[PDB]
Scaffold this active site. Sequence first.
Site, PDB file in Angstrom:
ATOM      1  N   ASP A   1      39.353  26.264 -51.445  1.00 55.26           N
ATOM      2  CA  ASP A   1      38.434  27.270 -50.949  1.00 55.26           C
ATOM      3  C   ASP A   1      38.815  28.602 -51.476  1.00 55.26           C
ATOM      4  O   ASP A   1      37.936  29.344 -51.860  1.00 55.26           O
ATOM      5  CB  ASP A   1      38.493  27.352 -49.476  1.00 55.26           C
ATOM      6  CG  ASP A   1      37.496  28.259 -48.802  1.00 55.26           C
ATOM      7  OD1 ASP A   1      36.608  28.798 -49.458  1.00 55.26           O
ATOM      8  OD2 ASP A   1      37.572  28.401 -47.580  1.00 55.26           O
TER       9      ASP A   1
ATOM     10  N   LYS B   1      51.058  23.844 -51.228  1.00 57.37           N
ATOM     11  CA  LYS B   1      52.194  24.584 -50.711  1.00 57.37           C
ATOM     12  C   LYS B   1      53.087  23.482 -50.230  1.00 57.37           C
ATOM     13  O   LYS B   1      53.555  23.442 -49.105  1.00 57.37           O
ATOM     14  CB  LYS B   1      51.745  25.437 -49.574  1.00 57.37           C
ATOM     15  CG  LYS B   1      51.879  26.927 -49.908  1.00 57.37           C
ATOM     16  CD  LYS B   1      53.115  27.562 -49.269  1.00 57.37           C
ATOM     17  CE  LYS B   1      53.727  28.664 -50.141  1.00 57.37           C
ATOM     18  NZ  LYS B   1      54.897  29.228 -49.473  1.00 57.37           N
TER      19      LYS B   1
ATOM     20  N   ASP C   1      51.199  29.443 -53.984  1.00 53.18           N
ATOM     21  CA  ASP C   1      51.195  30.867 -54.065  1.00 53.18           C
ATOM     22  C   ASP C   1      51.560  31.314 -55.441  1.00 53.18           C
ATOM     23  O   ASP C   1      51.082  32.349 -55.838  1.00 53.18           O
ATOM     24  CB  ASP C   1      52.139  31.431 -53.099  1.00 53.18           C
ATOM     25  CG  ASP C   1      53.558  30.958 -53.052  1.00 53.18           C
ATOM     26  OD1 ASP C   1      53.931  30.047 -53.775  1.00 53.18           O
ATOM     27  OD2 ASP C   1      54.297  31.535 -52.255  1.00 53.18           O
TER      28      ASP C   1
ATOM     29  N   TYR D   1      40.184  21.469 -42.350  1.00 53.32           N
ATOM     30  CA  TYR D   1      38.764  21.656 -42.210  1.00 53.32           C
ATOM     31  C   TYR D   1      38.151  20.594 -41.372  1.00 53.32           C
ATOM     32  O   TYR D   1      36.939  20.534 -41.212  1.00 53.32           O
ATOM     33  CB  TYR D   1      38.111  21.537 -43.483  1.00 53.32           C
ATOM     34  CG  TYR D   1      37.827  22.819 -44.168  1.00 53.32           C
ATOM     35  CD1 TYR D   1      38.817  23.744 -44.473  1.00 53.32           C
ATOM     36  CD2 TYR D   1      36.487  23.072 -44.495  1.00 53.32           C
ATOM     37  CE1 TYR D   1      38.442  24.931 -45.106  1.00 53.32           C
ATOM     38  CE2 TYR D   1      36.132  24.268 -45.130  1.00 53.32           C
ATOM     39  CZ  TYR D   1      37.119  25.179 -45.418  1.00 53.32           C
ATOM     40  OH  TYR D   1      36.775  26.363 -45.968  1.00 53.32           O
TER      41      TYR D   1
HETATM   42  O1  LIG Z   1      29.674  29.505 -45.531  1.00 55.11           O
HETATM   43  C1  LIG Z   1      30.333  28.587 -45.131  1.00 55.11           C
HETATM   44  O2  LIG Z   1      29.774  27.655 -44.579  1.00 55.11           O
HETATM   45  C2  LIG Z   1      31.821  28.441 -45.376  1.00 55.11           C
HETATM   46  C3  LIG Z   1      31.956  27.783 -46.632  1.00 55.11           C
HETATM   47  C4  LIG Z   1      32.647  28.265 -47.676  1.00 55.11           C
HETATM   48  O3  LIG Z   1      33.446  29.352 -47.977  1.00 55.11           O
HETATM   49  C5  LIG Z   1      32.355  27.394 -48.788  1.00 55.11           C
HETATM   50  O4  LIG Z   1      31.736  26.369 -48.912  1.00 55.11           O
HETATM   51  O5  LIG Z   1      33.014  27.765 -49.869  1.00 55.11           O
HETATM   52  O1  LIG Z   2      60.918  30.220 -51.598  1.00 49.82           O
HETATM   53  C1  LIG Z   2      60.581  29.937 -50.483  1.00 49.82           C
HETATM   54  O2  LIG Z   2      61.437  29.760 -49.633  1.00 49.82           O
HETATM   55  C2  LIG Z   2      59.140  29.907 -50.015  1.00 49.82           C
HETATM   56  C3  LIG Z   2      58.826  31.233 -49.603  1.00 49.82           C
HETATM   57  C4  LIG Z   2      57.810  31.963 -50.088  1.00 49.82           C
HETATM   58  O3  LIG Z   2      56.760  31.816 -50.974  1.00 49.82           O
HETATM   59  C5  LIG Z   2      57.979  33.292 -49.555  1.00 49.82           C
HETATM   60  O4  LIG Z   2      58.740  33.791 -48.766  1.00 49.82           O
HETATM   61  O5  LIG Z   2      57.007  34.092 -49.951  1.00 49.82           O
HETATM   62 MG   LIG Z   3      34.352  29.528 -49.853  1.00 44.75          MG
HETATM   63 MG   LIG Z   4      55.390  33.367 -51.278  1.00 47.71          MG
END
Ligand SMILES: O=C(O)CCC(=O)C(=O)O
Ligand SMILES: O=C(O)CCC(=O)C(=O)O
Ligand SMILES: [Mg+2]
Ligand SMILES: [Mg+2]
Lengths: 414, 414
Positions: free
Chosen positions: A305, A228, A281, A158
């Site tokens: 976010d 991640k 994830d 960001y």
């Molecule tokens: O509307 C924006 O400025 C982006 C910001 C955003 O998703 C947030 O602050 O969560």
């Molecule tokens: O296990 C991994 O290698 C990371 C990969 C991952 O989240 C994926 O392929 O979706």
């Molecule tokens: Mg947001």
């Molecule tokens: Mg994955």
Amino acid sequence: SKVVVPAQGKKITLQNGKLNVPENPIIPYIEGDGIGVDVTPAMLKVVDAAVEKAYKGERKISWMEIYTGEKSTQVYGQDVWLPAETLDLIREYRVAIKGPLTTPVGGGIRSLNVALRQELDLYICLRPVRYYQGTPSPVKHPELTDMVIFRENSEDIYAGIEWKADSADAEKVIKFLREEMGVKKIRFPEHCGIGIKPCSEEGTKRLVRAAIEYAIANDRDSVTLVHKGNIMKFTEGAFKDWGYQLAREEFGGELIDGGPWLKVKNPNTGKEIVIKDVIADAFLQQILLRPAEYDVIACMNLNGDYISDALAAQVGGIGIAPGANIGDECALFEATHGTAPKYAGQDKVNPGSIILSAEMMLRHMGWTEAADLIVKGMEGAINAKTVTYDFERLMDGAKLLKCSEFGDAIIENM
Amino acid sequence: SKVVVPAQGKKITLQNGKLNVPENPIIPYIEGDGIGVDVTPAMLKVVDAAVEKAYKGERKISWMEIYTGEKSTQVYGQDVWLPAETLDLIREYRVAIKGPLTTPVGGGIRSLNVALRQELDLYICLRPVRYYQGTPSPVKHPELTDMVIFRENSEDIYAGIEWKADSADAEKVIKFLREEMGVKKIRFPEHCGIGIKPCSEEGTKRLVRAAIEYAIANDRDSVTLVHKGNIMKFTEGAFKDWGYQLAREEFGGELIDGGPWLKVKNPNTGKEIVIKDVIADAFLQQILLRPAEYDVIACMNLNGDYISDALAAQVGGIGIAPGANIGDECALFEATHGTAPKYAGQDKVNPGSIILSAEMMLRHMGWTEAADLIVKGMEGAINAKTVTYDFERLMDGAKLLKCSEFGDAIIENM
Ligand SMILES: O=C(O)CCC(=O)C(=O)O
Ligand SMILES: O=C(O)CCC(=O)C(=O)O
Ligand SMILES: [Mg+2]
Ligand SMILES: [Mg+2]
């Protein structure tokens, strides 16, 4: 300067990280663009009623309008979207509230919500999400979700450090990466855009310090660092590791059997707090399947976010989610949704995001008693199935209310 | 070389982007680490039964084991985690399937799933998610979700281009950014890690081309480009814009009233397909609240990583979500979950992720009839409340089955 300071108010002052909040504090507010014209008058009505019902007349806020976004060009000139005066003024009056904001296209500026966050060094985006009984939810058991997100606001992707594809500067950056750094991992170097994601020791630790301090003061059960970190070893893995190192060194956490999880003991309480981590994830699945196992969440700017919007949705809170950006020398509370021009001026949208961010505001200020009143109010209004179109659409037998009318229904249930 | 080619099989060949699939094709498979030892034998049982029930004996797959991950060190040497031979062999036999994989810590390598994806230039991660009636879901109406994710696999932040904080190289990169490029936007330059996110014209377009071609062939209603294009203007905004430009130029899309949305007309069918875009954080809410408005989804590598896991969870599919990484000269289908060592060898986990990725495999190969049989099978097993622990935990009155036993229950309902 076109701001008019209230004649009768007094300024909050910061002394030793603790706020000194007078009985008549001046609080600046930014009306907001779009539906800010509808939700903001409702939040002033309601914060004002909550301090009168609570402190029975002794305390009064002197509200002070300041400007950013489209309403500021209409006041300062076509091209003035973020007056330096608003930055000085939020730092000076220490606490403020804003509604949604428009950023114009292209024309230089970043996204005004991020520009405030960053220019004013507001490093904590604190977004709590909790269920209010009665909200239409798309999830079966939304009441299990009580979580609090600590999103790092000053770095990650960001920071806006990026270059357009095929521009001279992008090519320089790629001649640098290939020739000087030996980088063979870019699939298509021609017509390629580049962005930089930074993550630093001091930036993650001031955020995680804040997150584990927030857990101890409010007696919460765990802090989850999400990341991640297995693909982004040095921005995001480093984020997990620094956060663990901070809980060992400064909070004296110690291993749970094999680890990696640490247990930090609450000094005020005896309960043990778990510091654990989840790859990002798998977290977006864990919050829908095992939502009771998570509580305070600590993450970098992009992950946070997304986590917060996913979370806000499962509890039926697209339009009622509160938000606050906090730094060491000030805070700015905000509505988390957009401007919605389609509906502006029509008094129909839901004003509960900014009202519930005013709750956080008062709580921060120390007016706990007015703040618990505003949540007594909103739990009554929603439970009386007395509500705005967004909730009325999805509900079996409710009274449709205008946006002003819903603020009154909140005053009615205090 | 320690792979043993089946004596009786024949190789798939690629002629003009179209596959030539013999009656006895050799299909290499990678067993997988961890629970790969349990789910993989079940998927062979079941794919083998589905081609016999379908083509009544004429077609047979000759399965060929190849190696990657922990089972390869046990076969080639302590330090051989991705033998060059497996890369040559997936390219040579054109189609393959794998179970979950362990990447060791630190020791050089990236994450073996990504290393395959990238080294073999498999640019499409195609992850469809759909509800199977009967799955325990945490969402009220999970049957509205029928979506298909097209995740760009070769770039974005996943390219692994990054440097550790305080290392010589990271400092070089930051002396470059400050001194040569005039970058003032890094909050803490000392003790800072840096990562690079690239997004290119050819990389996004080959993915979106694939996504809009997938929509036309299967008669789907919309393609959504999701992106955080308002903060990342040049990687992710460029992704939205290139994807729109591709649907105008190559598919002849034209504006819907004000736009930005384009309508592309299906040449085989007459239906109009909408190409729309959603900012990425609002998307994670839109998929839980208005899930019927979305269908094929197109995104970059990190956003897609998260969208798919969020989606897989809402339909109750943590353990049954299919996956495929597709390129121009080969494809590799995979289980999407981890290795789970706690449960390895105990025959208890759910084998439906790899089995449903074998469905995709056959469908790709053209053996539509065996592939529709494997989904007839799995809809029966789940509907007969005959299931593995993960679904039995959450269900009112089911028969607990071992992992091998659940493959039999799938053969039973074909
Ligand atoms: O509307 C924006 O400025 C982006 C910001 C955003 O998703 C947030 O602050 O969560
Ligand atoms: O296990 C991994 O290698 C990371 C990969 C991952 O989240 C994926 O392929 O979706
Ligand atoms: Mg947001
Ligand atoms: Mg994955």
